[model samples]
Target: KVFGRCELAAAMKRHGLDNYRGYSLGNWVCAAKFESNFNTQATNRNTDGSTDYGILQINSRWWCNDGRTPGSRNLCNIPCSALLSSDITASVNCAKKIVSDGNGMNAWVAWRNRCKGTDVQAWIRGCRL
Candidate 1:
């Protein structure tokens, strides 16, 4: 796990995620909580047989290669295993690229289902950022 929400916010801010594509740091924080509970190594198997990787739960369909998986478009050009690490630089970079690819943060289902239009300020409540 890389960060609690507060530390995540600070890290994201330092990484200039505060208003990337007009999305707030709070939105990302909320989405991360729902997606992985801040665990950078988190992985979830989807009903479709693909897997979601890392804190942002990036889908293997188009982003990274899971070795055994076939036909990965590999848009991020990284191994899925790279996402499952305490060092979040790769995941963060991949997410930024994804968001920039016309999907925005809406590419993340957790963000859409949980963070969107919700009061996410509480995700970063106690820590100084």
Candidate 2:
């Protein structure tokens, strides 16, 4: 609920989002657009038995036992809603923690790129998207 339709666009802008050209949101929107017309409340059980939950199609299973402490401050040590929060830089920064563990952007891009679109990982490595 932190990221709704009205706030999602702003959140994307805050997080250095350019377009869904080839990223998680793009792929998610692509699938979600087709599935439920980008319905934020849409839910579906994948053919592989994974439940896609939330607007961004965040897997509920991963977040179920994610050890997220609600209302806790300084999420740099523990990431929860930071990834999709209204603070774009904060969200991307938090995602970088979980995905790259401070290594780099590849981990985050790789995880989100699982569904596919533009090769953001490669582009980030100095290639073209």
The backbone clash count of each candidate, in order, is: 0, 3
TM-score of each: 0.92, 0.35
Q: Which pairs in model 1 have colliding backbones?
A: none
Task: Write candidate 2's Cα lDDT for 1-129 as tens digits.
Answer: 344433444444455553433344343223333433334455555554444433344433343223432332343542333333333454344433334344322332323344344543332233122
**RMSD after CA superposition, every candidate:** 1.4, 9.1
lDDT of each: 0.85, 0.38
Q: Report lDDT (Cα) of residue 115, candidate 1.
A: 92
lDDT of 2 at 107: 31
What's the true lDDT of residue 121 in model 1?
74
